[PDB]
Design an enzyme around this catalytic site. Sequence first.
Site, PDB file in Angstrom:
ATOM      1  N   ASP E  43       0.837  -1.192   0.000  1.00 19.98           N
ATOM      2  CA  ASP E  43       0.000   0.000   0.000  1.00 19.98           C
ATOM      3  C   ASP E  43       0.879   1.252   0.000  1.00 19.98           C
ATOM      4  OD1 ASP E  43       0.949  -0.579   2.469  1.00 19.98           O
ATOM      5  OD2 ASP E  43      -0.938  -0.256   3.544  1.00 19.98           O
TER       6      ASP E  43
HETATM    7  C1  LIG Z   1       7.315  14.049  16.512  1.00 23.38           C
HETATM    8  C2  LIG Z   1       5.894  14.359  16.975  1.00 23.38           C
HETATM    9  C3  LIG Z   1       4.963  14.663  15.805  1.00 23.38           C
HETATM   10  C4  LIG Z   1       4.177  13.436  15.350  1.00 23.38           C
HETATM   11  C5  LIG Z   1       2.685  13.564  15.645  1.00 23.38           C
HETATM   12  C6  LIG Z   1       1.825  13.090  14.477  1.00 23.38           C
HETATM   13  C7  LIG Z   1       0.473  12.552  14.940  1.00 23.38           C
HETATM   14  C8  LIG Z   1      -0.393  12.065  13.781  1.00 23.38           C
HETATM   15  C9  LIG Z   1      -1.102  10.754  14.113  1.00 23.38           C
HETATM   16  C10 LIG Z   1      -2.575  10.745  13.714  1.00 23.38           C
HETATM   17  C11 LIG Z   1      -2.765  10.698  12.200  1.00 23.38           C
HETATM   18  C12 LIG Z   1      -3.997   9.892  11.793  1.00 23.38           C
HETATM   19  O1  LIG Z   1      -4.184   8.824  12.270  1.00 23.38           O
HETATM   20  S1  LIG Z   1      -5.174  10.558  10.582  1.00 23.38           S
HETATM   21  C13 LIG Z   1      -5.808   9.171   9.596  1.00 23.38           C
HETATM   22  C14 LIG Z   1      -6.693   9.680   8.463  1.00 23.38           C
HETATM   23  N1  LIG Z   1      -7.473   8.574   7.941  1.00 23.38           N
HETATM   24  C15 LIG Z   1      -8.056   8.649   6.615  1.00 23.38           C
HETATM   25  O2  LIG Z   1      -7.896   9.616   5.951  1.00 23.38           O
HETATM   26  C16 LIG Z   1      -8.873   7.472   6.087  1.00 23.38           C
HETATM   27  C17 LIG Z   1      -9.080   7.328   4.581  1.00 23.38           C
HETATM   28  N2  LIG Z   1      -8.031   6.509   4.002  1.00 23.38           N
HETATM   29  C18 LIG Z   1      -7.082   7.113   3.086  1.00 23.38           C
HETATM   30  O3  LIG Z   1      -7.188   8.261   2.817  1.00 23.38           O
HETATM   31  C19 LIG Z   1      -5.971   6.271   2.460  1.00 23.38           C
HETATM   32  O4  LIG Z   1      -6.329   4.919   2.509  1.00 23.38           O
HETATM   33  C20 LIG Z   1      -4.647   6.457   3.201  1.00 23.38           C
HETATM   34  C21 LIG Z   1      -4.861   6.325   4.707  1.00 23.38           C
HETATM   35  C22 LIG Z   1      -4.061   7.830   2.877  1.00 23.38           C
HETATM   36  C23 LIG Z   1      -3.676   5.377   2.732  1.00 23.38           C
HETATM   37  O5  LIG Z   1      -3.475   5.559   1.359  1.00 23.38           O
HETATM   38  P1  LIG Z   1      -2.792   4.339   0.489  1.00 23.38           P
HETATM   39  O6  LIG Z   1      -3.164   3.013   1.107  1.00 23.38           O
HETATM   40  O7  LIG Z   1      -3.301   4.399  -0.931  1.00 23.38           O
HETATM   41  O8  LIG Z   1      -1.291   4.486   0.487  1.00 23.38           O
END
Ligand SMILES: CCCCCCCCCCCC(=O)SCCNC(=O)CCNC(=O)[C@H](O)C(C)(C)COP(=O)(O)O
Lengths: 220, 111, 459, 67, 88, 104, 128, 62, 124, 175, 178
Positions: E43
């Site tokens: 992925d």
């Molecule tokens: C050093 C300190 C800084 C760090 C702190 C950072 C904290 C951030 C942690 C929280 C972030 C999240 O979870 S936010 C999670 C957001 N979730 C979504 O958007 C669901 C929809 N899915 C998609 O868009 C795609 O499947 C995708 C996921 C892009 C995959 O793409 P590919 O499969 O095609 O590669």
Amino acid sequence: TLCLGAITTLFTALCAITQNDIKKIVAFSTSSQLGLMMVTIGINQPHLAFLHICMHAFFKAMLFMCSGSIIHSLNDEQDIRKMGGLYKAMPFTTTALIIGSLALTGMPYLTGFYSKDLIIEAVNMSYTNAWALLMTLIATSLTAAYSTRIIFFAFLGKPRFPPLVLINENNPLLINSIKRLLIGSIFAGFIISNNIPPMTVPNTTMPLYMKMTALIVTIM
Amino acid sequence: MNPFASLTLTTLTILTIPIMMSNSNIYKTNLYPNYVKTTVSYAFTLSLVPLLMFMHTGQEMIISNWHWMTLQTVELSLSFKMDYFSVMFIPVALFVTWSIMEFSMWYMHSD
Amino acid sequence: MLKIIIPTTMLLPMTWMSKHNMIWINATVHSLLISLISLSLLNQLGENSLNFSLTFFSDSLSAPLLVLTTWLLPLMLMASQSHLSKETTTRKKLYITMLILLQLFLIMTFTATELILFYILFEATLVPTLIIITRWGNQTERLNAGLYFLFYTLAGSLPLLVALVYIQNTTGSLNFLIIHYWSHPLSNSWSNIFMWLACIMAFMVKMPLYGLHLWLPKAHVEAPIAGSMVLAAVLLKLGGYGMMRITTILNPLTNYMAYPFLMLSMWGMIMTSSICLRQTDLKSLIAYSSVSHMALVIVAIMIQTPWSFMGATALMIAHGLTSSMLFCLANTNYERVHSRTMILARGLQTLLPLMATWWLVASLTNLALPPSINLIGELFIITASFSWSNITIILMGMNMMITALYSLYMLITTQRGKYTHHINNIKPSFTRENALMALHILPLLLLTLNPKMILGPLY
Amino acid sequence: VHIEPRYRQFPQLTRSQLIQAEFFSATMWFWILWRFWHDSDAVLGHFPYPDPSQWTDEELGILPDDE
Amino acid sequence: SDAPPLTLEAIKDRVLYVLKLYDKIDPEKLSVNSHFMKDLGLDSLDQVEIIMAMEDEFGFEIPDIDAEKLMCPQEIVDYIADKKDVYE
Amino acid sequence: QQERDPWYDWDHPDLRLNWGEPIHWDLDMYIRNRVDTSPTPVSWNTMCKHLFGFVAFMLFMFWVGEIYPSYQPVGPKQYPYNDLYLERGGDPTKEPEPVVHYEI
Amino acid sequence: SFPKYKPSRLATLPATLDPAEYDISPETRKAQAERLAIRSRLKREYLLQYNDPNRLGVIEDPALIRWTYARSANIYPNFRPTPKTSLLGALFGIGPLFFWYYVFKTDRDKKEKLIQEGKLDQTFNISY
Amino acid sequence: RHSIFAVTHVLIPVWIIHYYLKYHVTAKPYTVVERKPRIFPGDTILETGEVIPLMKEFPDQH
Amino acid sequence: GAHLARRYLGDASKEPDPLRMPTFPPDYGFPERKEREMVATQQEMNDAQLMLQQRDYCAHYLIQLLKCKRDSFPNFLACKHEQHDWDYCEHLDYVKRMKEFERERRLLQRKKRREQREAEMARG
Amino acid sequence: PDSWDKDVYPEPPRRTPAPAPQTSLPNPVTYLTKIFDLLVDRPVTLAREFIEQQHAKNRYYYYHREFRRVPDITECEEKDILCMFEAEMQWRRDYKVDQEIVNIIQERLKACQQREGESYRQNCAKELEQFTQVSKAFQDRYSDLGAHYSARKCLAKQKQRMLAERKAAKEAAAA
Amino acid sequence: AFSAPAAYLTHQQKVLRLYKRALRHLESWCVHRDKYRYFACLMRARFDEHKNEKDMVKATQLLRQAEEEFWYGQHPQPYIFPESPGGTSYERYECYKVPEWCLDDWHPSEKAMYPDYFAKREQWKRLRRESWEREVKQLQEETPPGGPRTEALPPARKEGDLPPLWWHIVTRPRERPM
Ligand SMILES: CCCCCCCCCCCC(=O)SCCNC(=O)CCNC(=O)[C@H](O)C(C)(C)COP(=O)(O)O
Ligand SMILES: CCCCCCCCCCCCCCCCC[C@@H](O)O[C@H](CO[C@H](O)CCCCCCCCCCCCCCC)COP(=O)(O)OCC[N+](C)(C)C
Ligand SMILES: CCCCCCCC/C=C/CCCCCCCC(=O)OC[C@H](COP(=O)(O)OCCN)OC(=O)CCCCCCC/C=C/CCCCCCCC
């Protein structure tokens, strides 16, 4: 002059203890040492300041040269976070940097001792601003702090540099240069100190605990 | 004639020769950095002598060798102080500079 | 001193009778020879002046100015023949005639024994300059510049003439020697105040004084290279010569009449130095630097102390040479890329190394790096001002910083960085331009070797 | 002296550089120990520091609170 | 002297070395022309991790807009060869 | 100009400008040799508060330590020949008031 | 949840912290498309002359000319005397002059008065 | 060819400098000034041949 | 340090002032006090050109040290006895200064307490 | 050497102690000094002997110019331009001479300061007093004339000072 | 740097960029490799926990909150590659980059040395001159009436064609010129 030197040395030493570029740490150490020279000028010992300048040139230049050797070997990389275990990979550079860090931190009877120890002991025995005294002591502790920071992050542990290892310090020019500056940083303090006329009045009477104060804060 | 003054002035004079030679068929060859390093080393070994003289007899001098201009009551001359500070600082700087040039011969090889 | 005046009058028909392809060669050779001859005026006394006849005399203040004028003429001749290649023969002879006439007028101006003949020649210098600017300038703005150059001067100089003739009716003479030996104090009255203002405002506007300087960027930017060279190097110094001459009859009024002019000069050197930092035009930066240096010279003359006078003379000479060099250096780039914008062509150190060396030397000399005579004049003026009042060291100190900034700024923007990609018509420097830069710069350091020659009669 | 890249191995070391490094560390430590053995007082002090409390009044010369 | 004259073959061997060291990619199946999404079944997060692994291997950063496009080891070899002026 | 994207293929890479786009009125103050307005990890006016507080604390503490100096429990240095009257400026025709020191 | 970052003039707001970017509309997408179209048209126009084998000289950029002309020659035609303009002009052009005049006049008056009573310590002040 | 560097870069400049100093600069008063050498009790002066007495019967706090 | 803590936190009235010392006459409690002597003459100190600070009561040992350092120049480890002698004299001078400060402290406290007691006795 | 007068530029008798080696080890300074002597000093002296021999074969002289004394500005009529000219030139020559006198005294003071070393504050009092006197007199004579100075301005300044001192003496006498 | 940019970044591009930035800054915080692997696996699990969110609004809200967390917890001094726009050797070798057209102005004596190079240079110049007009005509046909809408350029399609606007891309000075 005394107050300016004290604030300069404390602030620069406090800034240096969290830097990741080796050159920046060395530059901040030079700035703190200049602040210390301004301090010793402020309490009416100009010859001590001159002696400290002469002693400082050697090991500061050699510390910068060791840093430059490290930088050139690791494909022009300056961040200490990407330098791993160079204690065994760089024997001569590690030894030179160890001797330089020990001389900078006033290890007794090295080139840094013969000026820094006298400067601290003369600051303690003077009718002086108390705040400047406290800041000078905290700065001389932070000197050891950033020195061990450089040593710990540059030489100890496991490698963190890219896998194509091009480490090579076996060049006659670099070896001879650092060797000359090493001989200086080891012996110049004694050689110069025993060869000048006495231009100051010594502090032959000191409380025992105040005699080792620089050593105590350095160890801490 | 007390070689103190002549030696201490020649120490500074001999550093300017490579600047003069910078327009000859040595600034265009690959031997120029070593030539400069050798000049600096020779200057250091020569400046080592007035330091010994000062350590021996505490000898100090000032040399007002050239009279540049004279205002109405102020006289400006090319004068040098050869006291303890000068004679003790010059060899240290020369030694450090020599070591640094030798280091640069390898560090800056690809420039 | 007809031995110097007559050879220029003979430069005239020699130029007008030379072959069509030998005008530049003959002009340059004989102008250089005349400069060599005029070099003999530097043998000055320590007590009085050289009174050749009832009409002409030379002091230690005018001799370096005459040498500077004579040396400058061949430099303008060399710098001019590049862009005049397509011009016709008669127009080229007319251009050389304009330059020769300007030199003749300046030479006779710097040595007139009487103030009214000095006035006549110091206005006569206006005609060739206006003709040069308005005829051989490049852009449409030149016409307006000419107007700003003309009336700004004349509105300052017409009152002076009145005062001059009035003085002749009260003292009976305008000969400078009689004027000096029979000097009498000026009382505190409104008539004396306005006489002071009339005698001073012409030379104030010529320097120029801050607030009276709007004509200078126009004149110095819209003119051709020789016009800008002679405007900056020599014509600005007429005000300094005239004020150092005329101040002998104005005491003790100056003791309090210099206050507004001193304030204007100091705050205006600050303001123009700050203006230089944000300038998209490369020639305008040099014009405003000239304004700042002349403000320093004005302060020096208004203080009226020997050290200030020596500093004023040294700064006048040094600034003339340096500003002329800077104008030529900018003109080379303009001739290459046909634009004056400073950020257009960058990274020229990569393409033109020796010209970058000339740029660096000129910039270092501008910011008064010791032991250049720029620094000597600046430091003498600062010391005299500190004796005048201890707080001046603030303002002057400010200037000493800002200058360097914009100086290096110009260098760093024109020579350093990466070269512009789309500009590919940058040809290697010609021998003519390199020789021009060398002949500008070497006399500066030679004068550094023997600086008593340009410290004036107060030495 | 020819040394070639290793790609994830420890780099090649010549005996001379290790010899020089060990030598210079050894001489530094010998110098420190020798200078401490012979010049000890430079760190521990030379003259005993007095304590003002044990100073008798007779050598000090103040009266017994009467005059 | 300085570093050796990096060649295309060395670049390809290093890329394949980094890829075979991945627990989510089986070595025998992996070829120079294998597609990360189609043939290898990974992925986008895995592709980002692969790009960071190559950045750490070669010691220079690939911009995101260029990094997202690379899909096979041959593409990565071509990009690195172009960036480092490699022609032999 | 420091805020612009460095990974884009600008016409002028050092200035980070493209041929034909409008140029800011204050470009020469933003040429990235000059004034930088890029976002900081710590917010502005929190950096100002800490810097000003550090400077103010340092100045006040230096003043307080000046009115509370540190010294040794010792007396003034004693100088033999009438506080070195002649050596510190001569004046040999005035007979200065005697300065006498005693053993202890 | 975490301490907030507030922007200023000399430390602006990050692009990833901008709420305006996290609520989009088809109008926003269309506007971005027009912006790219303009940028691409300009880039094509530049690259056509940049790669020309017969082109010698400087590619004239009208934007640079407009910037210089606006900064230098267009200022006076678009100037009007307003209370803000007049007040700022009077302040910035007159206040420094009289401020420095008062400062220097006071200093010189003090110095002359001290000279008159004979107490300024002018010994060894030969040069002036 | 071997040691010609020390002749053309040290010997000739020092010859010129010594000639200039000993025959031109020192031809005017107060151009080269040396501070007076230290004199201590028990020393003998070269020119006059005089001796300076000892120092007041040291207390001998041995 | 403890003297700083005593003066700045405790009763400052019975703690000596370093800038203003001594307050009591030198012969206050002493019946007779020997005058402190010198060994080095003014001319000797001037000829040696020591410094304006090194011309203290230990200047003669310093002159001896300078002589031995000049005579045994290349052997710069030969000047050990005289250096120790000068250091010992300086240490004794510092001890004398400490005695002076402590005498000031005890005398000030004693006099203040005696005056307070006399006032108390006259108050009843 | 005899090039300059020793009375205008005096010096003390230049006492230097005799060597007293107290160590067995050879003094390097004396060996290096002997080497420098034999190698540098000898060649220069021979060249100077040759050049001096060449100079003595062609000997010629130049003279110091003598100027008579003419009537001063005080003996000058108000508009007698020739007398004012001569008096002014004489005044300028005297001004240059006074400047050179001050320069000589300043040179004396600088030489004393460098020569006396650590004891300059006490050993240089006489030169400091001489400079104080000469500077006070010169400052009274010539300071505050400004640029465009002339003999008439100096005369006016002197007359003002004499009037002031006469009034001060008369008022002091009345006390 | 080599690719033509698009009008906007989509949701997945923004999430991937946040993933890379967070991993890099965590590596800056976690100096040692094993600790970095631990916390990077934790971060990857945290990222893929919400990987299957069908509500785009909540996905954008989560992305927002993640960006605020990153800006609060970012390293003030992150590691930068030496040749990256924040690196210590970013533009170190730009002063050594000289354009090729400068060789057009060499003196004939300077061109006398290196004859074969200048023969090949004449070859390349002839090729560019012969291909320019075909490149221009191809660009005109392919390009849309309302001007180009991206910065992407077309490739060669015909027999002996060359990709239009290639001369200044192919004849780059070098990465390490001198
Ligand atoms: C050093 C300190 C800084 C760090 C702190 C950072 C904290 C951030 C942690 C929280 C972030 C999240 O979870 S936010 C999670 C957001 N979730 C979504 O958007 C669901 C929809 N899915 C998609 O868009 C795609 O499947 C995708 C996921 C892009 C995959 O793409 P590919 O499969 O095609 O590669
Ligand atoms: C933009 C830059 C261009 C150049 C500017 C040149 C500056 C020229 C300014 C002239 C300087 C002084 C002029 C007059 C001298 C004194 C000015 C006055 O303020 O002083 C007082 C004068 O008192 C009052 O101020 C009266 C004058 C008031 C009317 C004058 C007009 C001032 C208004 C400002 C106009 C701006 C002029 C510049 C226009 C561009 C002194 O008191 P007083 O003792 O009684 O007079 C002394 C003369 N006595 C002895 C014969 C009696
Ligand atoms: C004491 C007298 C003067 C007092 C100081 C007055 C303030 C002077 C202000 C000058 C304004 C200059 C404007 C034009 C300068 C050119 C623009 C410029 O240089 O850009 C700023 C440039 C870029 O910033 P970087 O951090 O390097 O970024 C690198 C990574 N991108 O950096 C600089 O040069 C900044 C220089 C400005 C410093 C001004 C502040 C100085 C304050 C001094 C007060 C302290 C006095 C101490 C007294 C000592 C006690 C005896």
